[PDB]
Amino acid sequence: FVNQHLCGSHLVEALYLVCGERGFFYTPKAMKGIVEQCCTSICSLYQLENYCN
Amino acid sequence: FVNQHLCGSHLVEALYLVCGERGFFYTPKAMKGIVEQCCTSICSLYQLENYCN
Amino acid sequence: FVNQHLCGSHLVEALYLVCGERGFFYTPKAMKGIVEQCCTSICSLYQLENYCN
Amino acid sequence: FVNQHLCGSHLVEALYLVCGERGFFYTPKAMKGIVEQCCTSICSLYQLENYCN
Amino acid sequence: FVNQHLCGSHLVEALYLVCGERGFFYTPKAMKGIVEQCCTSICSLYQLENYCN
Amino acid sequence: FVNQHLCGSHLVEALYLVCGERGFFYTPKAMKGIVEQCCTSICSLYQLENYCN
Ligand SMILES: Oc1cccc(O)c1
Ligand SMILES: Oc1cccc(O)c1
Ligand SMILES: Oc1cccc(O)c1
Ligand SMILES: [Cl-]
Ligand SMILES: [Zn+2]
Ligand SMILES: [Zn+2]
Ligand SMILES: [Zn+2]
Ligand SMILES: [Zn+2]
């Protein structure tokens, strides 16, 4: 429950680490919401698992 | 395997940049994938763009 | 036409990738405009070529 | 020694992510420390969490 | 006397480089002030030495 | 050559930090340049400052 400034490429780095061997997808049009949330608010590593392949 | 892991972190940041709005699916997985090509030799931004959506 | 949060050192990383073997220059006083633009608005990779050596 | 130095830069970013509000003390120092473990083999986020506060 | 957008993990990367072999600590609750200052204002590398071990 | 490429990405981020308002010209090019010195051995922030404007 602290903002982590997961803005821009930081979110892709976070997904890279969270998702491991599965990989992930990064689709700006479909992920406008989580992009904003992780940058200016808080988003959990558990929530980010939703973007693993 | 650590060097490949670290190389992948740089790759996903580069894809974030070059793919822009299109985004990308990251599959280190992929047969003949981006890690095989671009952690073995330097990929230009034109070569990295092949992996975008 | 999507902001990429190319703030702070991200802009230097972008120039590094765009400019390749030419290298680039980063001069905060002279580049106040593009620094602001790439961070809070949109700036193209083609525009960034203006700061390659 | 440069590879270990660069690996450490990635480690501290990963710890920033996984440790969240708890934070961490970074001691490359430490006997049986994080660089010995995680620059030799890939550490998952669960292994990295062992180094958090 | 120019802001360097040392936000989020950038501050931990800065501490990593500044502190060298000493290492550093990153404690969000205790360091709310310098976290804000380095992200939205200016903070010197000399000031950051206060968070080396 | 990939390791040198990745090392360079870290170097330009470190120069962004240490050079501050002065900025820098990045020439991987340069005879006896920063990649030869600092991707072979670890450069402190004082050694990196030699490459600033
Ligand atoms: O920009 C990059 C990053 C990582 C590997 C590579 O070949 C190119
Ligand atoms: O996420 C990371 C970063 C660096 C080394 C490692 O094993 C894992
Ligand atoms: O801070 C750095 C980054 C890359 C190489 C080096 O010697 C030092
Ligand atoms: Cl690296
Ligand atoms: Zn980074
Ligand atoms: Zn930022
Ligand atoms: Zn950033
Ligand atoms: Zn690296």
Task: Describe the overall structure.
Chains A, B, C, D, E, F: It is found in: Secreted. Chains A, B, C, D, E, F: This is Insulin. Chains A, B, C, D, E, F: Disulfide bonds join 7-39, 19-52, 38-43. Six copies of one chain form a homohexamer. By secondary structure, chain A is mainly α. Chain A has one domain (9-51): Orthogonal Bundle (Insulin-like, subunit E). The first copy, chain A, has helices at residues 9-19, 32-40, 45-48, and one strand at residues 24-26. Chain A starts with 8 loop residues before the first helix and ends in a 5-residue tail after the last helix. Chains A and B meet through helix 1 and strand 1 of A and helix 1 and strand 1 of B. Strand 1 of chain A pairs antiparallel with strand 1 of chain B, so a sheet runs across the interface. Bound molecules: resorcinol (RCO) (3 copies), chloride ion (CL) and zinc ion (4 copies). Residues 7, 10-11, 14, 38-39, 42-43 of chain D line the site of one resorcinol.
- Total helical segments of chain A: 3
Helix content of chain A: 40-55%
Number of domains of chain A: 1
Oligomer: homohexamer
Number of strands of chain A: 1
The CATH architecture term of chain A is Orthogonal Bundle
Through-space gap between termini of chain A: 26 Å
What is the rounded Rg of chain A? 10 Å
User: Biggest sheet of chain A, in brief?
Assistant: none
CATH class of chain A: Mainly Alpha
Question: Could you state the CATH homologous superfamily of chain A?
Answer: Insulin-like
Which molecules other than protein and nucleic acid are bound?
resorcinol, chloride ion, zinc ion
Helix/strand/pairing class of chain A, anyone? mainly alpha
Q: What is the string of SSEs of chain A from the N terminus onward?
A: HEHH
Query: Biggest interface and its residues per chain?
Result: A-B, 18 and 19 residues
Report the CATH topology name of chain A. Insulin-like, subunit E
How much of the sequence lies in strands of chain A comes to 5-15%
Backbone shape of chain A: globular
Family (chains A, B, C, D, E, F): Belongs to the insulin family.
Subcellular location (chains A, B, C, D, E, F): Secreted
Protein name (chains A, B, C, D, E, F): Insulin
Function (chains A, B, C, D, E, F): Insulin decreases blood glucose concentration. It increases cell permeability to monosaccharides, amino acids and fatty acids. It accelerates glycolysis, the pentose phosphate cycle, and glycogen synthesis in liver.
